């Protein structure tokens, strides 16, 4: 598996709401911080990472770990204060924390029967 | 099939424009109205329903009907007056009616040959 | 994906010879060190890790990351000084380093044509 910009490798995600924060965690083991990039653009968060390809002159006996470009885009709802995103990378897990900023007097749709 | 929040069961959809209204219908048989929730957030409508799991102490001879959490999200175009959504549930069909509110002087892209 | 002892989750591996050392690296993100166990038994190295299941009372919106028991067994050749294995865990990567201890006067099989 070698991810490219046009066909990125995907990384698995857990996402959950923790009270007033929305949290997303990605398994992104073995990434150098120079690679990690988090782009925010209105409601959309894009995570991009790279793991370099193995030296072509190196004979691997096993080479199962995914390499190249990783990318995933999250479309967040309007109540997420994307501007206040906090990001951390530890133990090979990229964790994003976005505050939830509920609008006042939210719509509640009733269903007719 | 048991749908969860993280892996919802999906329900089939018909959607069509009827003059000045956009209509969406979902097959959602056997849902108690207490379960149905329709969330609107800017242009996105999210439909959520639950059908309870069968009593674990009940021996079913057939149990093919999907149970648990159903969810589907619709990304609507800007001309849809989502604030004026009307929703009804009858005969196991959830019907949504969204008025279409065309903007003035819409762009018409011409193609060069 | 929930790995058990009888059906462990598998983790990807790179393995290569680096001069006088054999190196194996595993992607094992988000493991607490209390979980990691490396058992050596003659020529066989077994790696075992656990990632706890999500609290059943927690509603996840996405839960793609593999959880439960991870395990992989490596059958190493006789020239690997398994007794002198060195193991490290950083950035979610479990790295094993085994010294290579070549026997004297190794057999070289010639092929008749």
């Amino acid at each position: 598996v070698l991810g490219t910009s046009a066909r990125p490798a995907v990384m698995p995600m857990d996402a959950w709401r923790e009270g007033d924060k929305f949290v997303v965690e990605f398994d992104l083991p073995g990434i150098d911080a120079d690679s990690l990039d988090i782009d925010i653009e209105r409601n959309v968060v894009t995570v991009r990472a790279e793991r370099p390809a193995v030296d072509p002159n190196r004979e691997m006996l096993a080479s199962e770990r995914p390499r190249g470009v990783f990318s995933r885009q999250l479309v967040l709802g309007e109540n997420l204060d994307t501007a206040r995103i906090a990001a951390s990378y530890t133990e090979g897990v990229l964790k994003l924390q976005i505050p939830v900023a509920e609008k006042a007097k939210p719509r509640k749709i009733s269903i007719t029967r | 099939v048991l749908g969860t929040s993280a892996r919802p069961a999906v329900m089939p959809m018909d959607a069509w424009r009827e003059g000045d209204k956009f209509v969406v219908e979902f097959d959602l048989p056997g849902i108690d109205a207490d379960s149905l929730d329709i969330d609107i957030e800017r242009n996105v409508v999210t439909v959520r329903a639950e059908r309870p799991a069968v009593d674990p102490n009940r021996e079913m001879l057939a149990s093919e009907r999907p149970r648990g959490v159903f969810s589907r999200q619709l990304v609507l175009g800007e001309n849809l007056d989502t604030a004026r959504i009307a929703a009804s549930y009858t005969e196991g069909v959830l019907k949504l009616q969204i008025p279409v509110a065309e903007k003035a002087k819409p762009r018409k892209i011409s193609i060069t040959r | 994906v929930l790995g058990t002892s009888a059906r462990p989750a598998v983790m990807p591996m790179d393995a290569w010879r680096e001069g006088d050392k054999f190196v194996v690296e595993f992607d094992l993100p988000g493991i607490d060190a209390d979980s990691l166990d490396i058992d050596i038994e003659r020529n066989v190295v077994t790696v075992r890790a656990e990632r706890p299941a999500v609290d059943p009372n927690r509603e996840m919106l996405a839960s793609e990351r593999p959880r439960g028991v991870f395990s992989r067994q490596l059958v190493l050749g006789e020239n690997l000084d398994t007794a002198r294995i060195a193991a490290s865990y950083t950035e979610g990567v479990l790295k094993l380093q085994i010294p290579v201890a070549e026997k004297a006067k190794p057999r070289k099989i010639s092929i008749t044509r």
Partner: peptide, 5 residues
Amino acid sequence: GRLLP
């Protein structure tokens, strides 16, 4: 905490 699948 809304997210689009």
